[PDB]
């Protein structure tokens, strides 16, 4: 009755909160983490994930370093950002837990090779992606049978009404924008069930959630984990608040959906989709057949109140996830 | 207090019903019609419009023939269809009003030149487009000042959530698909207010409208106009009914919106948009900046009950448009 | 006599090409049509009208056409001050002095003029030495126009994907300026088409530079020689600063229209199309080499004959042969 | 000795190229890596292993790589039965007879093998004679791999946009088979790159066909001559039916790797990239002609030396010179 997880992540503010949720939730069993380039470099992602494990008073979970670049490494696709800090998590390396030089090293084996090996042996595990899809796509390029290895794939990324969240010249969502080829490969060639948490799920209900949930309340308990997550989210919170809104949950929702999909996904729809690669403004956009597409489940509305309750349980140490 | 209209159309089943609505509505003053290629050839469009004027017991309204092809005339863009009949309006040329050989000829002047001349002199007129945008785009190529000539442009076409209605390999809406370049030119380079009636307005409420409106009731009065519109829509109605739904209004909504926008457009949104030209699956799709775009008004929900009331008034001869 | 209509963006080499046509006794010019290109369409019009005066001619209509490319995408833009802000040396007070009326055309849009003129003169050759926008608009208005010229001679395009705009593109300049127009014209014209591609200039550039003095025809001190000296002045100075002569370009397309058998020494006939969607290859000609109507590409031209004709034009010697 | 690793799709000309490398006394083969291409990767592997036996060699590892192109888009597909369903004449019972174990590789994926082998042998040349998928996967796993080979010799691409797949494309065959891979390799490898483009074959096709008997080296009646006769049989019959000899292709890239100064008679150094997004130009090399590391293109090769080497290989004469 535990859910076995492998989480692939670019290790910035929301990623580390999402990973903390998974490390504290009693239903979750984390087999490994895999780091991918994204909002920060892959080395920094690796370091942030390892630092987060320590913050959660855990050990002996392997973190594998993966792709440094997108498949093509085209400059127009680049999504590296200092929005959350240069280090992705508040730029305070001396605060608990203090950054160590070994944090920037992985277990040894490339993430893509680790994904193959781990999921071959653990066919009942869920793979959750909360960065660009590069590691998963490289696994497929190496081993077409990997298409069947995960029990389920839960992706934070993409869209279904072409609502982009990178900039005004693209209709792509951030993680897809960061490696459009990889997203194309994964959506077309995976054979397990896929659940996508699209950008629209966040976009359309953001003003409503901002009125009804205090997204900072779980940070205030004064536990080590609360204090670490306060630091990690600090620069994101200040910048959002300067624009009159709260820094709200994103990647956390994908990890929560992995843990209990029926609880967190209030509404969902199955759609037949593919990814545009060649358009000037639409590269990285999901294209839906509303009239080589694959049927995928989209979460169209999520239970933000349950995710919030779980984060309070995680940071307070209450253990109250029911 | 009359609204002066120029209507540009490809002259198939819904076009001819829309044009009939405009010819019967006491608030509308029709300056001219312009024919464009689309679901049928431009010659057939011209013929269908002229036949429709006669069916409405009107005369002395000029019909100008326009573009035979899209700007590029690429085969992948082609939207010619026999869905409504070979002639676009039920394939019964001998029924009232009988087709005449002169129906396939226009006034003489190319439509695009007529659009320039008429709207230069009638700066208070609304231009309504219910086919591909080729004629309007050619006018702009000839005369950049045309960008200011219409008082308002009401377009039946496009989309705002990338919901396509042509086929499963495109996210474009039909009229945009038929000439993507023209749609790009018009949206970028017109300077008057633009109101677009997008495909989503029809798509999302179709099952609801199908339950609550009888779209065939206005056809049953036994007047000449009812009988003509019965013929014109006959093949569309049989094919829709064979798939368990009614043939519902489409182009009629754009003409109605031109006549009284505040009445017909129940909800609307302004968005900053451009048109994708280069994508494999997204050519012709509208791209929205949700984060060279132009601000346009989209009608997101329309009052189908008022349009239905107006069509009953038109076909019955009641004159009851209030 | 060969009847010509010349569609041009009216910069330095255009003006010299048009002068060649005005002086050559085999040519009969029906009309000029101005198109945007290296300068605005208004400036092109003005330059063409000024050039007609410098050649001691009158009563040839100049029609103003497209101000913009079909799409008017900013990445296609080819406006340049390389030959001067006015495209011909920036000395509006020198003979013939620029007049305000130079910036106006005959009245009707060039594209409508091309339809009318060529409908009535089906034995005429259309020569294009700017972007193809006017010709493409004509086709959009009138598909029958596809058959009206007896021949179309195009300065533009390429056949080995050698670009001359910048390192971001494999397109030639005139095609880069309106890729959609080039696509329409090459697919939809039905008359014989002769293209003078960029490679014809590129490959023999250094050989020509060694064997021909491209300035000598300017030395005669006639009014036309002094006008062409002015028109080409900024180009010549900029080329010489980089170790090269300012050499003929558009002149070759006009010469080819006057006597194709003499000027086109070697030719290839190819099936072609124009790429529109590529990131680096938008505007490039794409050739089917693994074997619609074949198009004739001039692969080598007789620069010495063109030079001899330009000497005759500027000197007034009549020696065209 | 020149140390080689050869990455191949294992069809008729590949097998002859590999035989050249196995017989030439200057070559030392570290390993072969199989890639999808004209046949499946499994068949490529099998063909390479069979070829090693036909050459009286043993104990050279063959690693199986990518089954598909990076994207696996159906429009890129280049699988063909032109040389037979098995790519080498469809006679599995002839010497050396096909074994079931031929379809298996050494174990580790070719891309991982390329990293390992070339990390330890930084003086080796990598030669690619199929699509570039394996090399691109290696780079995705290990950006340092960019510096591992001492040189990369690629059979593929073009420099004047002359395609050899069909009229819908300006791409060369190996590049058409995985455009993304070609883009990655040409942008991200940092070692010297020599490309043997399609134009080197195309332009001199008819001259070579007149001066070289491309079948004569098959006539010796040695086991290798009989095996290469079989391997090339269906190609030869299909070319002869169309009035042409089946001429060398991949063999030239392998020969160039063995002695680049001898085989590459003329070369050009160009800055290049690969178009991915064009409708007709996807996979085409785009060259910057208006002047990252320049790449060397072999524009003319010494077919007579390659022919002499193939005679020595099949005859057993030792006469490589
Ligand atoms: Ca993330
Ligand atoms: Ca219509
Ligand atoms: Ca010019
Ligand atoms: Ca090969």
Chains C, D: CB contacts within 8 A come to 75
The span from the first CA to the last CA of chain A, in angstroms, equals 15
3-class SS at A35?
Answer: strand
Point out the residue among C166, C286, C290 whose CB comes nearest to the CB of D280: C286
Q: Does C242 touch chain D (CB under 8 A)?
A: no
Residue D76 DSSP label: G
Query: Residues before each break in chain D (C–N > 2.5 Å)?
Result: 291
Range of the domain at A55: 1-322
Question: What is the H or E stretch that residue A19 is in?
Answer: helix A13-24
Q: Does A230 touch chain D (CB under 8 A)?
A: no
What phi, psi does A156 have (nearest 5°)? -90, 105
**Chain D residues close to A292, C-beta within 8 Å:** 74
Query: Which chain B residue's Cα is nearest to A165?
Result: B291
Point out the residue among C163, C170, C289 whose CB comes nearest to the CB of D163: C289
Q: Does B190 touch chain C (CB under 8 A)?
A: no
C319 exposed, middle or buried (CB, 10 Å; 0-12, 13-18, 19+)?
A: exposed
**Chain D residues close to A275, C-beta within 8 Å:** none
Q: Does B28 touch chain C (CB under 8 A)?
A: no
Instruction: Identify the chains in contact with D, defined as 3+ C-beta pairs within 8 A.
Output: A, C
Q: Does C190 touch chain B (CB under 8 A)?
A: no
Distance from CA of D80 to the nearest CA of C (A): 17
Query: Which chain A residue's Cα is nearest to B203?
Result: A290
CB neighbourhood size of D266 (10 A): 10
Distance from CA of A141 to the nearest CA of D (A): 6
C213 exposed, middle or buried (CB, 10 Å; 0-12, 13-18, 19+)?
A: exposed
What phi, psi does D312 have (nearest 5°)? -65, -45
Cβ–Cβ below 8 Å for B73 and C183: no
Q: Does A161 touch chain B (CB under 8 A)?
A: yes
Annotated binding residue at D129?
A: yes
Q: Do D153 and D257 contact (CB within 8 A), yes or no?
A: yes
Separation of CA D193 and ligand 4 centre (Å): 18
B162: left (phi over 0), alpha (psi -120 to 50) or beta: left
Question: What is the H or E stretch that residue D29 is in?
Answer: strand D27-34
Active site residues of C: 9
Pairing mode of beta strands C295-301, C285-287: unpaired
| Closest by CA position to D173, among listed D197, D205, D137, D206 | D197
Cβ–Cβ below 8 Å for B141 and C137: yes
Which residue has tokens 């080796």?
D124
Distance from CA of B113 to the nearest CA of A (A): 32
Q: Does B76 touch chain C (CB under 8 A)?
A: no
Annotated binding residue at A10?
A: yes
**Chain C residues close to D166, C-beta within 8 Å:** 290
Residue B66 C-alpha from the chain's centroid:
15
Selected residue of B34, B133, B141, B182 to mutate for chain C interface (largest C Cβ count, 10 A) = B141
Cβ–Cβ below 8 Å for B110 and C141: yes
Separation of CA D87 and ligand 4 centre (Å): 10
Cβ–Cβ below 8 Å for B283 and A279: yes
Annotated binding residue at C81?
A: no
Q: Residue D175 CA: which ligand is closest?
A: 4
**Chain A residues close to D74, C-beta within 8 Å:** 292
Tokens of C261: 């058998």
Cβ–Cβ below 8 Å for B185 and C70: yes
Q: Does C147 touch chain B (CB under 8 A)?
A: no
| Closest by CA position to A164, among listed B190, B168, B285 | B285
What is the Cα–Cα distance from A53 to D298, expressed in whole angstroms? 55
Provide the domain count of chain A.
Answer: 1
Point out the residue among D67, D71, D133 whose CB comes nearest to the CB of A181: D71
**Per residue, what are the HEC states of D262-317?**
HHEEEEEEECEEECCCCCCCCCCEEECCCCCCCEEEEEEECHHHHHHHHHHHHHCC
**Per residue, what are the HEC states of A243-285?**
CCCCCCCCHHHHHHHHHCHHHHEEEEEEEEEEECCCCCCCCCC
What phi, psi does D19 have (nearest 5°)? -65, -45
Helix axes D303-315, D12-23, angle to 10 degrees: 70
Half-sphere exposure in the Cβ direction for C218 (13 Å, CA): 15
Cβ–Cβ below 8 Å for A287 and B165: no
| Closest by CA position to A136, among listed A184, A83, A82, A207 | A184
What is the Cα–Cα distance from B250 to B231, expressed in whole angstroms? 17
Q: Does C66 touch chain B (CB under 8 A)?
A: yes
Distance from CA of C179 to the nearest CA of B (A): 11
Distance from CA of B261 to the nearest CA of A (A): 26
**Chain B residues close to C71, C-beta within 8 Å:** 181, 184-185, 277
What is the Cα–Cα distance from A98 to C224, expressed in whole angstroms? 82
Residue D29 C-alpha from the chain's centroid:
15
CB neighbourhood size of D261 (10 A): 7
| Closest by CA position to C153, among listed C10, C258, C64 | C258
What is the Cα–Cα distance from A117 to A148, expressed in whole angstroms? 13
CB neighbourhood size of D277 (10 A): 22
What is the Cα–Cα distance from D133 to D129, expressed in whole angstroms? 11
Tokens of A21: 């949720």
Q: Does C18 touch chain B (CB under 8 A)?
A: no
**Bridge partners, residue B287, by sequence:** B274
Cβ–Cβ below 8 Å for C140 and B67: yes
A108: left (phi over 0), alpha (psi -120 to 50) or beta: left
Residue B322 C-alpha from the chain's centroid:
24
Which residue has tokens 């003979």?
C95
CB neighbourhood size of B305 (10 A): 11
| Closest by CA position to C87, among listed C125, C33, C140, C36 | C36
Tokens of B267: 């909800």
Annotated binding residue at B251?
A: yes
Point out the residue among B72, B112, B138 whose CB comes nearest to the CB of C180: B72
Residues 6+ apart with CB under 8 A from B204: none
Point out the residue among A163, A287, A291 whose CB comes nearest to the CB of B282: A287
Cβ–Cβ below 8 Å for D289 and C163: yes
**Per residue, what are the HEC states of chain B?**
CCEEEEEEECCCHHHHHHHHHHHHCCCEEEEEEEECCCCCCHHHHHHHHHHHHHHCCCCCCCEEECCCCCCCCCHHHCCCCCECECCCCCCCCCCCCCCCHHHHCCCCCCHHHHHHHHHHHCCCCEEEECCCCHHHHHHHHHCHHHHHCCCEEEEECCCCCCCCCCCCCCCCCHHHHCCHHHHHHHHHHCCCCEEEECHHHHHCCHHHHHHHCCCCHHHCCCCHHHHHHHHHCHHHHHHHHHCCCCCCCCHHHHHHHHHCHHHHEEEEEEEEEEECCCCCCCCCCEEECCCCCEEEEEEEEECHHHHHHHHHHHHHCCCCCC
**Chain A residues close to D140, C-beta within 8 Å:** 67, 69, 71, 134, 138, 141
| Closest by CA position to D168, among listed B76, C73, B176, C176 | B76
Query: Which chain D residue's Cα is nearest to C272?
Result: D167
Q: Does D85 touch chain A (CB under 8 A)?
A: no
Q: Do C143 and C184 contact (CB within 8 A), yes or no?
A: no
Query: Which chain D residue's Cα is nearest to A110?
Result: D141
Q: What is the resolution of this structure in A?
A: 1.6
CB neighbourhood size of D292 (10 A): 9
**Per residue, what are the HEC states of D143-189?**
HHHHHCCCEEEEECCCCCCCCCCCCCCCCCHHHHCCHHHHHHHHHHC
User: Strand (E) positions, C252-308?
Assistant: 264-270, 272-274, 285-287, 295-301
Residue B7 C-alpha from the chain's centroid:
8
**Chain C residues close to D276, C-beta within 8 Å:** 279
Pairing mode of beta strands C151-155, A265-275: unpaired
CB neighbourhood size of D319 (10 A): 11
Q: Does D299 touch chain C (CB under 8 A)?
A: no
Cβ–Cβ below 8 Å for B280 and A278: yes
What is the Cα–Cα distance from A22 to D165, expressed in whole angstroms? 51
What is the Cα–Cα distance from C319 to A145, expressed in whole angstroms? 79
Helix axes B251-259, B13-24, angle to 10 degrees: 20
Query: Which chain D residue's Cα is nearest to C274?
Result: D280
Pairing mode of beta strands D125-128, C295-301: unpaired
Cβ–Cβ below 8 Å for D163 and C290: yes
Active site residues of D: 9
What is the Cα–Cα distance from B306 to B259, expressed in whole angstroms? 12
| Closest by CA position to C12, among listed C199, C257, C237, C316 | C237
What is the Cα–Cα distance from A261 to D272, expressed in whole angstroms? 49
């Amino acid at each position: 009755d535990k859910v076995k997880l492998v989480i692939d992540s670019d290790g910035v503010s929301d990623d580390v909160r999402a990973i903390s949720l998974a490390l504290q939730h009693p239903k979750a069993e984390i087999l490994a983490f895999t780091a991918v380039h994204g909002c920060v470099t892959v080395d920094q992602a690796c370091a942030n994930i390892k630092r987060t494990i320590r913050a959660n008073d855990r050990s002996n979970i392997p973190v594998y370093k993966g792709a440094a670049k997108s498949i093509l490494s085209l400059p127009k696709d680049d999504t590296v950002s200092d929005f959350f800090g240069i280090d992705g998590i508040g730029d305070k390396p001396e605060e608990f837990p203090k950054v160590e030089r070994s944090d920037f090293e992985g277990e040894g084996k490339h993430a893509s090779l680790a994904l193959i090996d781990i999921l071959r042996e653990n066919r009942d595990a869920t793979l959750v992606t909360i960065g660009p899809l590069t590691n998963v796509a490289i696994a497929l390029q190496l081993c077409e049978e990997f298409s069947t290895y995960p029990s389920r794939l839960v992706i934070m990324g993409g869209n279904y009404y072409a609502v982009g969240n990178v900039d005004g010249g693209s209709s792509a969502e951030y993680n897809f924008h960061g490696d459009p080829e990889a997203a194309s490969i994964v959506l077309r060639r995976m054979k397990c069930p896929i659940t996508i948490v699209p950008w629209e799920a966040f976009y359309f209900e953001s003003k409503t959630h901002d009125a009804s949930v205090d997204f900072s309340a779980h940070l205030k308990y004064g536990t080590p984990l609360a204090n670490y997550l306060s630091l990690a989210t600090s620069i994101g919170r200040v910048k959002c608040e300067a624009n009159g809104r709260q820094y709200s949950y994103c990647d956390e929702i994908a990890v929560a959906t992995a843990i209990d999909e029926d609880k967190i996904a209030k509404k969902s729809q199955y759609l037949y989709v593919d990814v545009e690669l060649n358009g000037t403004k639409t590269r990285g956009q999901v294209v839906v057949d509303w009239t080589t597409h694959r049927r995928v489940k989209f979460v169209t509305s999520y239970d933000v109140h349950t995710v919030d309750k779980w984060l309070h349980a995680a940071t307070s140490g209450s253990g109250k996830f029911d």
